[PDB]
Ligand binder design. Structure first.
Ligand SMILES: [Mg+2]
Ligand SMILES: [Mg+2]
Ligand SMILES: [Mg+2]
Ligand SMILES: [Mg+2]
Ligand SMILES: [Mg+2]
Ligand SMILES: [Mg+2]
Ligand SMILES: [Mg+2]
Ligand SMILES: [Mg+2]
Ligand SMILES: [Mg+2]
Ligand SMILES: [Mg+2]
Ligand SMILES: [Mg+2]
Ligand SMILES: [Mg+2]
Ligand SMILES: [Mg+2]
Ligand SMILES: [Mg+2]
Ligand SMILES: [Mg+2]
Ligand code: NA
Ligand code: NA
Ligand code: NA
Lengths: 144, 214, 210, 203, 98
RNA sequence: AGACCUGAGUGUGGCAGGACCACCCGCUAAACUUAAGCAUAUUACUCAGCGGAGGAAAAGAAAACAACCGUGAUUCUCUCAGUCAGCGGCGAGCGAAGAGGGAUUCAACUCGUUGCCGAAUCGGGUCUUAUAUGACCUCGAACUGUGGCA
RNA sequence: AAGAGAGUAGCACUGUUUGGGAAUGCAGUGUCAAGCCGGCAGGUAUUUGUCUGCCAAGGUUAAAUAUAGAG
């Protein structure tokens, strides 16, 4: 809304908050990111230290669909099951089966304390996730 | 986009004892040597000409829109808030008002008017009738010549029993599916006189749900 | 004074704005609700003209490519020549009774082929096939008063007869096998991954060994 | 058939017998006009491949074009502005000489419809093409279902808009897929698509 | 059915085993078959017209015994090296026949 | 003297030019400006100049994507994506594609060539209520190949 | 039983164009193919061997799209 702007407060002040000595002029320091190495060096070095220069190898025709790999931790496995199933199964009983591809996940990382045993189907798995799920009474079935 | 800028004006420069504004070329027209192209000049271009890609419309979160409708419906159930908005409900009984389903079968406007008098909703209709007047200002030149107030609502289970209740000035018709917040809270103020048919009243539990019931 | 801000990169220096000297390069959407109404009117009009033919022709079920969409199914352009032969329908005659035909699809596995063959067989058993001449009926066609019972399909996807897409059912709870509670699956998977990753280096080592 | 022998014989252009025939023909063409009408095509098998059909309404012309690069038409060979835009002799035209021959014939004779063309001869100064044309007012053309599409008004001067085989070549339309993404409908059509500013109603 | 797949990602046969129908014979495979009629027609024409100046230079180089120099000459004239090796085999065989 | 080839004159029946030009197709083609200077870069494959259509134009039926459990002519839309793709005094700046959800979609055909035929084709005249995809005639065109079947 | 478009595609130099980077598309001149283990594409140059997808150099074609100083 125009009625909330500072322009409404400045009607009658003749300068609009820009001063009498150094006025409001057009581009007193250049346009855009000009002079980033000459008269704006301190600002660039202080806040954007990695702006100038190159780093690493190149990759033509990236095709981001080939590197799709979402991850989920062992601590969040309960959110993929029904509420009753979390407390229904333990150790030697029949365990729920979780398929990670249907829910949109690829790799199973093992972080935190596992709540309930289960059978998880995944494309990739971790060293720690494999050991923790096996001790708790579950298993991992590899997918494709 | 070309308004005010269809001349070949240019500045006379300095040394001619005139201001440095661009001036129109030519001679023999009384427009020659006149100021041009500036927002301060007569017949010039205005400051910051308006465009059509201004942001005209707005997005609102779906949950917030459903919250607003639910709040306005509850406000219509309190007689104190209904009277405070401006409705005359002195002769009504048992707000919120629910009437039988034989109303949908009316065919003549005379029958509809008798029903409004029986349940006491005619006072709000008369309030709208007496308030009709010619609008003040330039708006009367732009296809909105008369102004009137907002009367009762009548909510129906569908778009079936409408023919008798149309043409009655000051009565609004609504469908229980697709309730409109702009109609439930005219001007942003909550609490509107609403008359419910029995069939539409029984559908409110399904449409909006309860607590602990989706 | 500038402070701690991001570097902008706004990309707007190419005379896109209409002014007194530039035509501009813009696109607005003020006709969006009007075009929605028009398209709906044409769909209803087409349905009235072609009655009782279905709105959309039959299409096959296919698998999406790449690893991101491996598990997803959608509708394809048309049926395969191998599939049509399996269901005993000629391709040029198939296009006549509302079946889309694709002459480029390959049918690289039997699971995809069997699903699409079942789609054609169900569609064939549901067709009524009004006779070309009502006085003289030839071949197995619609009988009298079977024509009067026909009804147009407006499913927006052509699923009146075949239905939805076929996806394997979710597995049921079971017990962990004794070998499943012992085998190290990361060791199993890493060994296979290393076999391909270090194929060239291992061959070079053996060649040098000779 | 007989086509096979004529076709393979024309792939031995650098042979003693073929070079003799072309040398005599090139001398003969050098003493004729820029545009000449022929009773029958010089290469009958090449003409039938690109549309000629030896019926009433089909005509063949031989057109001559000059060789070399384009010279910029600036006064005294002087350019102005940035040095990047300099040079009057070293730049080339963005149209090929096959399409220049088709456009020179169509512009001169406005009552014909240009169909196609093919290569015939060349020397150090000139290059020769033969252009197949059709007229649209003849009864034999108008009643033939395989050619009467050209009677329609949308095909007027199709060679001036780069719609022929030679025109499609310099427009990049021989390519497909990732080799022609930036010019597939047209070069200007793709530029409009990628540079217009879009304002959704509820952006 | 060629090479049934394993059930897992990675490991020389990446996973999701299916039944893997073999292939369709198609009609573009005739492009890889010999063309007897095309070969015979070219034999007649090459008889009629004789030899080109490029082939005369190659034949005179092969007579001396400069096979490497012949290939370098053909590669410059013809472009790719696959085409150059084909041309040298053709001129050499014609010399052997005659 | 008579053919064929190449080329003229006249007569009969037709067509082209000019206008419009918002959008569309083909060529030609700047500088102001930004880089706090400026020459590569940018503005911009834009403005100005020339030519050509329509009710839309152009494109369009794989010498295409991908690397998967595989998609399947063209066009357009959201998104991919101001991109941890890429180009660049690597500075200022610039900058797409495959996939995915959709709009539309009974969408597809055929010349040349190969094989079997070889005027069965075209023009003109006459007849059938008819400048018939019909019939008859035709030292008219066409075998230096029009048409028909796979 | 056969066949499927040659100064064409490719290569060298020069110029322009592109995000296309030991060269994305195109133009001029020189040179100029294969089809008996064929040709083109597979985003880092060269030689050699596999695998995958297509089969250029002739033509027509509605609908969904534009109307940024027209009728
Ligand atoms: Mg003060
Ligand atoms: Mg201030
Ligand atoms: Mg200051
Ligand atoms: Mg004004
Ligand atoms: Mg300061
Ligand atoms: Mg102006
Ligand atoms: Mg004109
Ligand atoms: Mg017009
Ligand atoms: Mg400057
Ligand atoms: Mg400055
Ligand atoms: Mg300066
Ligand atoms: Mg068209
Ligand atoms: Mg650019
Ligand atoms: Mg023929
Ligand atoms: Mg076309
Ligand atoms: Na007033
Ligand atoms: Na212009
Ligand atoms: Na060439």
């Amino acid at each position: 809304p125009t009625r909330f702007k500072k322009t409404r407060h400045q009607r009658g002040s003749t300068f609009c908050g820009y001063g009498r000595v150094g006025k409001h002029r057009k581009h007193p320091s250049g346009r855009g990111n000009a002079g980033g190495e000459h008269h704006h060096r301190i600002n660039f070095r202080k806040y954007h230290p990695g702006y100038f220069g190159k780093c690493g190898m190149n990759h033509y025709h990236k095709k981001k669909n080939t590197t799709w790999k979402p991850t989920i931790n062992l601590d969040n496995l309960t959110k993929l099951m029904a509420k009753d199933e979390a407390m229904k199964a333990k150790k030697g009983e029949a365990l729920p089966v979780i398929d990670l591809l249907a829910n949109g996940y690829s790799k199973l990382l093992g972080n935190g304390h596992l709540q309930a045993p289960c059978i998880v189907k995944a494309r990739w798995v971790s060293k720690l996730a494999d050991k923790k799920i096996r001790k708790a009474g579950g298993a991992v079935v590899l997918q494709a | 986009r070309l308004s005010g800028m269809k001349h070949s004006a240019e500045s006379w420069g300095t040394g001619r004892a005139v201001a440095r504004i661009p001036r129109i070329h030519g001679g023999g027209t009384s427009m020659s040597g006149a100021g041009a192209f500036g927002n301060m000049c007569r017949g010039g271009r205005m400051f910051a000409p308006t465009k059509i890609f201004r942001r005209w419309h707005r997005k609102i979160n779906l949950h917030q829109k459903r919250f607003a409708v639910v709040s306005a419906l509850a406000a219509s159930s309190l007689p104190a808030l209904v009277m405070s908005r401006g409705h005359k409900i002195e002769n009504v009984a048992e707000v919120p008002l629910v009437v039988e389903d034989g109303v949908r079968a009316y065919e003549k406007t005379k029958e509809a008017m008798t029903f409004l008098k029986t349940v006491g909703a005619i006072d709000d209709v008369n309030r709208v009738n007496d308030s009709r007047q010619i609008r003040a200002g330039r708006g009367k030149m732009r296809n909105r010549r008369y102004v009137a107030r907002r009367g009762p609502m009548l909510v129906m289970p569908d778009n079936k029993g409408t023919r008798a209740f149309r043409n009655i000035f000051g009565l609004d018709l609504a469908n229980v599916n697709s309730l409109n917040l702009l109609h439930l809270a005219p001007g942003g103020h909550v609490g509107r006189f609403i008359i419910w048919t029995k069939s539409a009243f029984e559908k409110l539990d399904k449409i909006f749900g309860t607590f602990t019931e989706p | 004074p500038k402070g701690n801000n991001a570097i902008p990169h706004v990309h707007q220096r190419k005379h896109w704005n209409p002014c007194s000297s530039q035509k501009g390069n813009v696109k607005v959407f003020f006709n969006q609700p009007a075009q929605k109404q028009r398209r709906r009117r044409l769909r209803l009009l087409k349905a009235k003209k072609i009655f009782p033919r279905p709105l959309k022709a039959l299409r096959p079920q296919v698998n999406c490519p790449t690893v991101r969409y491996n598990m997803k199914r959608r509708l394809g352009r048309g049926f395969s020549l191998e599939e049509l032969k399996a269901a005993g329908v000629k391709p040029r005659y198939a296009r006549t009774i509302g079946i889309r035909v694709d002459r480029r699809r390959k049918n690289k596995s039997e699971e995809g082929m069997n699903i699409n063959v079942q789609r054609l067989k169900t569609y064939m058993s549901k067709l009524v096939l009004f006779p070309l001449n009502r006085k003289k009926p030839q071949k197995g066609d619609a009988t009298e008063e079977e024509v009067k019972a026909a009804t147009q399909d407006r499913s927006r996807y052509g699923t009146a007869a075949v239905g939805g897409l076929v996806t394997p059912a979710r597995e049921a709870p079971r017990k962990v096998t004794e070998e499943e509670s012992t085998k190290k699956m990361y060791k199993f998977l890493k060994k296979n991954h290393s076999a391909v990753r270090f194929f060239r280096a291992r061959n070079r080592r053996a060649a040098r060994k000779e | 058939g007989s086509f096979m022998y004529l076709n393979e014989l024309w792939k031995k252009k650098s042979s003693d017998v073929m070079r003799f025939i072309q040398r005599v023909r090139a001398w003969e063409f050098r003493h004729q006009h820029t545009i000449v009408r022929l009773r029958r095509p010089t290469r009958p098998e090449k003409a039938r491949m690109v549309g000629y059909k030896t019926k009433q309404g089909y005509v063949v012309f031989r057109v001559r074009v000059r060789r070399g690069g384009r010279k910029r038409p600036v006064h005294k060979g002087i350019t102005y502005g940035k040095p990047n835009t300099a040079g009057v002799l070293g730049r080339k035209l963005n149209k090929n000489n096959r399409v220049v021959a088709e456009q020179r014939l169509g512009k001169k004779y406005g009552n014909l419809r240009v169909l196609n063309s093919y290569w015939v001869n060349a020397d150090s100064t000139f290059l020769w093409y033969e252009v197949v044309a059709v007229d649209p007012m003849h009864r034999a053309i108008r009643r033939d279902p395989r050619i009467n599409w050209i009677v329609n008004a949308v095909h007027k001067h199709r060679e001036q808009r780069g719609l022929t085989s030679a025109g499609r070549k310099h427009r990049g339309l021989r390519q497909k897929g990732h080799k022609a993404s930036k010019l597939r409908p047209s070069r200007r059509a793709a530029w409009r698509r990628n540079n217009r500013m879009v304002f959704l109603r509820k952006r | 059915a060629p090479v049934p797949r394993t059930g897992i990602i990675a490991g020389f046969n990446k996973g999701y085993k299916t039944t893997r129908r073999a292939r369709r014979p198609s009609s573009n495979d005739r492009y890889a078959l010999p063309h007897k009629k095309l070969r015979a027609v070219k034999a007649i024409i090459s008889d009629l017209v004789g030899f080109s100046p490029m082939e005369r230079r190659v034949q005179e180089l092969l007579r001396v015994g400069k096979d490497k120099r012949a290939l370098k000459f053909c590669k410059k004239r013809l472009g790719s090296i696959k085409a150059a090796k084909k041309r040298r085999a053709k001129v050499e065989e014609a010399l052997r026949q005659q």
